[PDB]
């Protein structure tokens, strides 16, 4: 296969394509969640910014939700990810699912 | 090619894949295979003159 850093770089590059379209955005996220891993924050950052370029706020939030979901019972993952993503969330004005009340059943 | 405005496409993404990806291709803008992204475009009607 390839090293962890080559995998991550391939993904960051994917989401950073300036003219990435909506289809490519969905394809990327839908494909990425099939792997045995929770995406590194650098990947998520690139995906969130692709959402900004596509004027898609809802997808940005959904991406945050899937990050949490992929962690399964490892509750320490999501809060770390959100911590690493804070500058970006603030810059782009992205509210976490918790801040929107979408974490309550 | 199609004689109507939609046709089922089966995409064998990579040579030797045992899994075929199936989807309806509609008249209009080209659509992409849900799995590998290759493009397909429907070109409707005729056959029988």
């Amino acid at each position: 296969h390839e090293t962890d850093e080559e995998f991550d770089a391939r993904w960051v590059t994917y989401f950073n394509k300036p003219d990435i379209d909506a289809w490519e955005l969905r394809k990327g996220m839908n494909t990425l969640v099939g792997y045995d891993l929770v995406p590194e924050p650098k990947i998520i950052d690139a995906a969130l910014r692709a959402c900004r370029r596509l004027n898609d706020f809802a997808s940005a939030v959904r991406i945050l939700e899937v990050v949490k979901d992929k962690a399964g019972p490892h509750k320490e993952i999501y809060p770390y990810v959100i911590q690493e993503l804070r500058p970006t969330l603030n810059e782009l004005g992205i509210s976490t699912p918790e801040e929107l009340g979408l974490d309550k059943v | 090619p199609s004689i109507t405005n939609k046709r089922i496409v089966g995409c064998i993404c990579e040579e030797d894949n045992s899994t075929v990806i199936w989807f309806w291709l509609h008249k209009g803008e080209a659509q992409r295979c849900p799995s590998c992204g290759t493009h397909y475009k429907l070109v409707p009607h005729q056959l029988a003159h």
């Binding site: 955005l25 969905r26 996220m29 839908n30 969640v33 099939g34 900004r52 004027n55 898609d56 706020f57 809802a58 997808s59 939030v61 959904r62 991406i63 939700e65 899937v66 949490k68 979901d69 782009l92 004005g93 992205i94 509210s95 699912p97 801040e99 929107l100 009340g101 979408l102 974490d103 309550k104 059943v105 | 939609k6 309806w24 509609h26």
Partner: protein, 144 residues
């Protein structure tokens, strides 16, 4: 919002943990205020209110992950009902014993069984482990 039968050939919406971004938006038709919200969405999201962000989410998706992954009380109904039907089965067995089955052979009478048991012990049935092995031939009783 409203799905139709003959739309089976068209891309559809689904709420799945492993397919976070569905093929279509939950709501495709927009009202005047909704169209305006989609416009406001093109500007800084910091200017969007919590309520507006929730509405944008709700236009794109039907249920949040928390909502779609909720557990239910269905197991109570399943287990309770299964037990009720298993209980009902015993009623059928009661009916059977009463109206269908006649008396069992005389060899099950208490006295016959006591005698048959001594005879089995006399012929030393299963003396290594199974039966006679459980009888104390010296103290003349079942081994404690």
């Amino acid at each position: 919002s409203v799905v139709k039968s003959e739309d089976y050939a068209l891309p559809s919406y689904v709420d799945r943990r492993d397919y976070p971004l569905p093929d279509v938006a939950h709501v495709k038709n927009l009202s005047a205020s909704q169209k305006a919200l989609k416009e406001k969405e093109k500007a800084s999201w910091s200017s969007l209110s919590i309520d507006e962000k929730v509405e944008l989410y709700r236009l794109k998706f039907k249920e949040s992950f928390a909502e779609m992954n909720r557990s239910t009380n269905e197991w109570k109904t399943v287990v309770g009902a299964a037990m009720f039907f298993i209980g009902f089965t015993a009623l059928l067995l009661i009916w059977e014993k009463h109206y269908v089955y006649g008396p069992i052979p005389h060899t099950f009478e208490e006295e016959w069984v006591a005698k048959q048991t001594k005879r089995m012990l006399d012929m030393k049935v299963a003396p290594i482990q199974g039966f006679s092995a459980k009888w104390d031939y010296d103290k003349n009783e079942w081994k404690k």
